[PDB]
Design a protein around this nucleic acid. Structure first.
Ligand SMILES: Nc1ncnc2c1ncn2[C@@H]1O[C@H](COP(=O)(O)OP(=O)(O)O)[C@@H](O)[C@H]1O
Ligand code: BEF
Lengths: 622, 93, 80, 76, 93
DNA sequence: AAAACGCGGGGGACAGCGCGTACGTGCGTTTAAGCGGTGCTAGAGCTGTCTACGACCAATTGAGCGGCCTCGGCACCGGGATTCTGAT
DNA sequence: ATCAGAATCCCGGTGCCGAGGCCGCTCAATTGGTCGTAGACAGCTCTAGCACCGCTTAAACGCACGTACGCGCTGTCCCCCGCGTTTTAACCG
């Protein structure tokens, strides 16, 4: 409402000691501020005397203090080492690059005309910038916007005067026109190089749509299921003129991947990402509908499970023609509030995507089938027939493809289990938690993995040397991890480590920081932006990171991890399907390195039982 | 049914059953359960009436903890009856 | 921190405002944690005694209600 | 709505019960009852304490105020 | 399974006193626990009184004295009156 | 033996006035926490069998209750020593 | 710094009532047996409330600022003490 400091970009010396004082900062150093309710590119150099008394000064002090401490421990501190400065200028340049890209627009929302002090009815563009949700969206000058990105303004104009709007979407639900078995890429798909199996899947799902019933894309993780989804959305919106809104609900951390896929295989098609705070939602409500007492313009709306649950009611009004769920494994619980919410959603056709269709128990497969098609769905020898008749019944409604039969270029997958000996400290903790007075199966798992997980196990085993020797020698699992990490570093390989516990990941991060390896971490507590930065860095052509720390399912459900060769699973997650789904994060079609999977198991512990019983779940897949 | 013939809404028979099974005395009079059911019905009717009045004052068709607690605490009578009592999810007067 | 400090200064604040307190002294908070601490010791002691008698390894809402009823503040809502 | 704060209260209750017994395993309803009772007690006590301050010609409650309230209640 | 609660009866009284209003599971639990508390209190009083009078039976006059002691006043007369109408009409049939 | 009136008198109430510690109040961060969702498996909560346990009943008797009767011990008194108390 | 004047206090004397013992014979105790059935025990199926992790975001923490009130000090003047004196209600045969 009133101009004032909101974010600060960077610093500099106005004109050419260890701890700058307040006067030293105020006079010599000068700061590039952003003003509130302004674009992120309308920045300006500023100094205390010029800004005067204005809100945000506390943030000017907080950033300046961060700058002073940074200048203290870059090199003028007594302790200086090459790794330290490397991390400092690395984080510095990353922050610079992110803020530099915060300037350029990503999309334009609307154009409005307003009289200025001079009376000109100059046009103004509301513009969303890259790496921002629709919150903090400002009306920028039309002239500046067209100069800065004429291409985006062209896409904007095409969007507002688009021949693909929902409002005259055809209504073929009375009888769906019969299709023709496609043998070539339709010219609509502007990504190119669609695979033969992907065409077969598109035609399978089109035949199923035409017949009217629904199905689950059960192709195993890493066969371009997202690309098939985008191709079929374009197919509905072009071949069948069903312009009307579609909803894609995807796990978070894969939403940017879905924007990339939609834009690169269908640039003309409009998609709206639906996340951010309540202001982001409100700025979406400003645009997704018209100010009138109703039509949808957005061709597709992308969102996540949490946002579906939160805005169930408000989205529930919108007549959806195609609702597609990615990674249909959170829909395996009938009681799940997402299950109830999606049933409550008013949807013409539902599609499910999952690398792993059949989960731990047949009840989950039954629940998935029922939510696909509601109302349409022991002794050993009777069971042997019954499973097969249920399977035969669902084969027309399921499509699954194996990486071995098709995509021969995908190198074979090798998985190996390494039985590890429990160290002395782990054994001691183990016997302690088989009794009381050391001062649940979880505690066995923690003790088997690594004793630092416990509250005050630091003193029990324990300069720079001492901490590292303690951490390595405390777990035989970690000792084998050292041998493999050094071997892979010698071989120039890249690794990603799947740990169930966030504390396991924290222990790994402290270890790798101490030993000096550069890594990248992705976890549930990580905000969406910096997760995307993490994935972009690890996937860039140049990558000084050799280790990717991951949870079992935050980065092991739907994320893309091109350019990794080794997957080290610390422990099974009680679900072999989820273990496989994490394992297929490096066995994508885009891998020419013959991924090898090392699963670490402690001997004479709970993990042997865990594997022996996950074996039962594997046998039930048949 | 003893309650239905009684024209009281409370179970005279089950009150008698609990008085027998509660080790209260070896024999229970015929009129004691009847009288106790009558007083229980009366107190419930009074409290429910007050709760409904509070709900009307709050323009709500639904009687919630705050309605019941507000009734009990505004009314001096029930307040002295249940002064050293706390109603779950109940707000302050 | 230790979970006695889990009862946060804003929580103590909201309690006081509900009870009608206009201002709270900084020394109030420690002692509120203290009285909360001793009351919980009493009620949990009676509840655990109830379970131990019942050969039940799970504190039950009926046990909590019975404990409170003896201490002199009957709790309605969780009856069974 | 409830104001003594859920998970902090549950953990406080857990360590309090830890001293009286080990491998003791609460119920959700039991935790709710405990929190509601403690809420009621503390609101009553702050009402008393504010009476005490108002009688001492003070608007801000004090340690001495809450100790007065307690030692007239009698648990102290 | 058969659960010991005053559900249907509180519903019946509530529809009698306020036909439009309804009560949910939680508030029924509040009413049920309250009625159980009042009823336990009255029955304990009656048993204690029969004991102190060395009388080994319970009856409407026991409950008379219990209700009169427990209810603070200005519903004591009402509770006595409705209980008495119930017990005379019982002893008739 | 206690209550009730009355007088002067000291002590302290109550109000005012000042200063300064402490308080509430933003300002946003970092924190943690609903409110979903995972996989357990401790341990209910329930049933069924069968034993020792306990409730009633005579028959036998020995601890308790009321009545009765002594005499230590407590309350009582005067007189004598102890004592905390201003008052100047 | 001191000692006079009330109250408190030490001892022991005499008188009276209740405590504590004894006695009888009342009543319920204590074996001794029998029968029924409540609980211990064993066993099963199934609940539900762990342990943690997402994810968003309300809430808590820290810090800084300004000023309303806590506590102290002083001053005056109402309102009780603390007798002495005069009623008065009570005292226990
Ligand atoms: N034909 C293709 N051309 C280019 N990239 C592809 C193709 N097929 C798949 N990919 C890439 O593979 C990645 C993974 O797709 P997939 O694992 O099947 O689904 P999801 O992305 O939902 O996990 C996508 O991010 C996509 O970029
Ligand atoms: F197919 Be996986 F979920 F990327």
């Amino acid at each position: 409402d009133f101009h004032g400091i909101d974010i600060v970009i960077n610093h500099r010396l106005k004109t050419s000691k260890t701890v700058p004082d307040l006067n030293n900062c105020k006079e010599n150093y000068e700061f590039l501020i952003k003003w509130t309710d302004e674009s992120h590119l309308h920045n300006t150099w500023e100094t205390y005397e010029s800004i005067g008394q204005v809100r945000g000064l506390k943030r000017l002090d907080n950033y300046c203090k961060q700058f002073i401490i940074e200048d203290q421990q870059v090199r003028l501190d007594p302790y200086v080492t090459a790794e330290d400065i490397e991390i400092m200028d690395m984080e510095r340049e990353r922050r610079l690059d992110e803020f530099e890209e915060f300037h350029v627009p990503e999309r334009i929302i609307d154009s409005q005309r307003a009289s200025l002090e001079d009376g000109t009815s100059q046009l103004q563009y509301l513009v969303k910038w890259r790496r921002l949700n629709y919150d903090e969206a400002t009306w920028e000058n039309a002239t500046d916007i067209v100069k800065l990105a004429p291409e985006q303004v062209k896409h904007f104009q095409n969007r507002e005067n688009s021949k693909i709007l929902p409002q005259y979407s055809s209504n073929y639900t009375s009888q769906r026109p019969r299709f023709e078995k496609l043998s070539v890429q339709p010219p609509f798909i502007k990504g190119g190089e669609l695979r033969d199996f992907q065409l077969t899947g598109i035609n399978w799902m089109a035949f199923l749509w035409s017949k009217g019933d629904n199905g689950i894309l059960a192709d195993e993780m890493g066969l371009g299921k997202t690309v098939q989804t985008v191709a079929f959305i374009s197919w509905l919106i072009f071949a069948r003129r069903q312009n009307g809104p579609h909803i894609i609900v995807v796990p978070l951390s894969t939403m940017p991947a879905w924007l990339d896929t939609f834009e690169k295989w269908a640039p003309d098609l409009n998609c709206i990402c639906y996340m951010g705070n309540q202001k982001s939602r409100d700025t979406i409500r400003e645009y997704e509908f018209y100010t009138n007492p109703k039509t949808m313009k957005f061709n597709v709306l992308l969102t996540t499970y949490e946002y579906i649950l939160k805005d169930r009611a408000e989205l529930g009004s919108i007549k959806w023609q195609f609702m597609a769920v990615d990674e249909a494994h959170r829909l395996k619980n009938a009681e799940s509030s997402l299950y109830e919410s999606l049933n409550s959603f008013k949807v013409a056709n539902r599609m499910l995507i999952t690398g792993t269709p059949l989960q731990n128990n047949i009840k989950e497969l039954a629940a998935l089938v029922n939510f696909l098609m509601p109302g349409r769905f022991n002794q050993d020898e009777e069971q042997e027939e019954y499973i097969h008749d249920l399977h035969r019944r669902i084969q027309p409604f399921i499509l699954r493809r194996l990486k071995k039969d098709v995509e021969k270029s995908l190198p074979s997958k090798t998985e190996r289990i390494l039985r590890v000996e429990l160290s002395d400290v782990q054994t001691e903790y183990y016997k302690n938690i088989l009794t009381k007075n050391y001062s649940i199966m979880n505690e066995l798992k923690k003790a088997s993995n690594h004793p630092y997980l416990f509250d005050n196990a630091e003193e029990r085993v324990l300069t720079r040397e001492n901490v590292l020797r303690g951490l390595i020698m405390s777990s035989g699992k970690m000792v084998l991890l050292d041998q493999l990490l050094t071997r892979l570093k010698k071989d120039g390989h890249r690794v990603l480590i799947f740990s169930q516990m966030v504390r396991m990941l924290d222990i790994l991060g402290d270890y790798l920081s101490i030993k000096g390896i550069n890594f990248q971490r992705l976890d549930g507590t990580v905000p969406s932006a910096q997760r995307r930065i993490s994935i972009d860095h690890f996937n860039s052509p140049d990558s000084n990171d050799f280790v990717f720390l991951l949870s079992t399912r935050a980065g092991g459900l739907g994320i893309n991890l091109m350019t990794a060769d080794t997957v080290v699973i610390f422990d099974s997650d009680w679900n072999p399907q989820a273990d496989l789904q994490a394992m297929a994060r490096a066995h994508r079609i885009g891998q020419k390195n013959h991924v090898m999977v090392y699963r670490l198991v402690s001997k004479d512990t709970v993990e042997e039982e865990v594997l022996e019983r996950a074996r039962k779940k594997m046998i039930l897949e048949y | 049914t003893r309650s239905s013939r009684a024209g009281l809404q409370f179970p005279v028979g089950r009150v008698h059953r609990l008085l027998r099974k509660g080790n209260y005395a070896e024999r229970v009079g015929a009129g004691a359960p009847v009288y106790l059911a009558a007083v229980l019905e009366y107190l419930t009717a009074e409290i429910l009436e007050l709760a409904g009045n509070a709900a009307r004052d709050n323009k709500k068709t639904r009687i919630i903890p705050r309605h019941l607690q507000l009734a009990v605490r505004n009314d001096e009578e029930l307040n002295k009856l249940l002064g050293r009592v706390t109603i779950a999810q109940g707000g302050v007067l | 921190r230790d979970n006695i400090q889990g009862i946060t200064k804003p929580a103590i604040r909201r309690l006081a405002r509900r009870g009608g307190v206009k201002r709270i002294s900084g020394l109030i908070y420690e002692e509120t944690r203290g009285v909360l601490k001793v009351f919980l010791e009493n009620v949990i002691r009676d509840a655990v005694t109830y379970t131990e008698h019942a050969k039940r390894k799970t504190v039950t809402a009926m046990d909590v209600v019975y404990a409170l009823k003896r201490q002199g503040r009957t709790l309605y809502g969780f009856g069974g | 709505e409830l104001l003594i704060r859920k998970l902090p209260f549950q953990r406080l209750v857990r360590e309090i019960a830890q001293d009286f017994k080990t491998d003791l395993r609460f119920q959700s309803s039991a935790v709710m009852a405990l929190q509601e009772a403690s809420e009621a007690y503390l609101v009553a006590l702050f009402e008393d304490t504010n009476l005490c301050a108002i009688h001492a010609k003070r608007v801000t409650i004090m340690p001495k105020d809450i100790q007065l309230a307690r030692r007239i209640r009698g648990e102290r | 399974t058969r659960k010991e609660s005053y559900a249907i009866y509180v519903y019946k009284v509530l529809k009698q006193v306020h036909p439009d209003t309804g009560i949910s599971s939680k508030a029924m639990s509040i009413m049920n626990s309250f009625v159980n508390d009042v009823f336990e209190r009255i029955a304990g009083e009656a048993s204690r009184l029969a004991h102190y009078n060395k009388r080994s039976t319970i009856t409407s006059r026991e409950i008379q004295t219990a209700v009169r002691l427990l209810l603070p006043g200005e519903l004591a007369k009402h509770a006595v009156s409705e209980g008495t109408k119930a017990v005379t009409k019982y002893t008739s049939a």
